[PDB]
């Protein structure tokens, strides 16, 4: 046995999401803290990070059930209701369909956010 | 007031570990590639792959969802690993996943990657 070098999951899809798609540190920082914007770095941004999980596949459909399994005990009623509200998703393209879910997300449960 | 911000793998962690007496030790020897067939640590690892619908309830692997959560141009070298190493097999589900991190870690042994 030989040590492996380590890859955490989240790190790399971050890393690589932000370079797909021109995001700023400012910008995932602004999103990690709940505050969105409908521009596609950021959007686009959001979009990837869930699809690495199998959150959304790429035609911008999104897994309720994949969800609810990583969303904390304390949430799961709650996210029952507002998924029920916010799926599927609407809006004029992949990322702004991701746009549109978070922002009636937001609207929903206004003291509830994550970041994966 | 701005939300309560839920870090969802950390909590997905926080979970399973509590479920199953695991302590920080433990999990982070895991994340080093460490590896032991001590149920305490077994069962995290089964719980915390069956809340991201890696597996189900028997610790069959989701294929689909398994090499989703890797980028494109590691594909042909994961869809090897699961040649190798699919389906699961062992007397009880944290068995089962014990020996599916030994055989992804003999399978793969540059590398190592985690949740
Ligand atoms: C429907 C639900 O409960 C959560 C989906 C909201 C989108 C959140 C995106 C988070 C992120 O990209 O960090
Ligand atoms: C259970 C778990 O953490 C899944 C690890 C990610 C897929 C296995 C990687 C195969 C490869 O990249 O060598
Ligand atoms: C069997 C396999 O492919 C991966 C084993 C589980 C690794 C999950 C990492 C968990 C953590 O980092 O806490
Ligand atoms: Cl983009
Ligand atoms: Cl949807
Ligand atoms: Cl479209
Ligand atoms: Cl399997
Ligand atoms: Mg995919």
């Known amino acids: 046995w030989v ?3 380590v890859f ?3 790190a790399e899809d971050k890393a690589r999401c932000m370079s797909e ?3 700023t540190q400012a910008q995932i920082d602004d999103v990690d803290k709940g505050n969105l914007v409908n521009e596609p770095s950021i959007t686009c941004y959001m979009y990837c990070l869930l699809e690495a999980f199998s959150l959304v596949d790429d035609e911008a459909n999104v897994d309720e059930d994949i969800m609810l399994g990583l969303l904390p005990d304390q ?3 709650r996210a029952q209701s507002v998924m029920g ?3 599927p998703t609407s ?3 992949n990322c702004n369909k991701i746009y549109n879910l978070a922002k009636c997300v937001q ?3 206004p003291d ?3 970041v994966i």
């Open 21 to 23: 798609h021109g995001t």
């Open 75 to 77: 949430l799961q009623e």
């Open 91 to 93: 809006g004029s393209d």
């Open 85 to 87: 509200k916010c799926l």
């Open 8 to 10: 955490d999951l989240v």
């Open 107 to 109: 609207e929903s449960a």
């Open 3 to 5: 040590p492996p070098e």
């Open 112 to 114: 509830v956010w994550f």
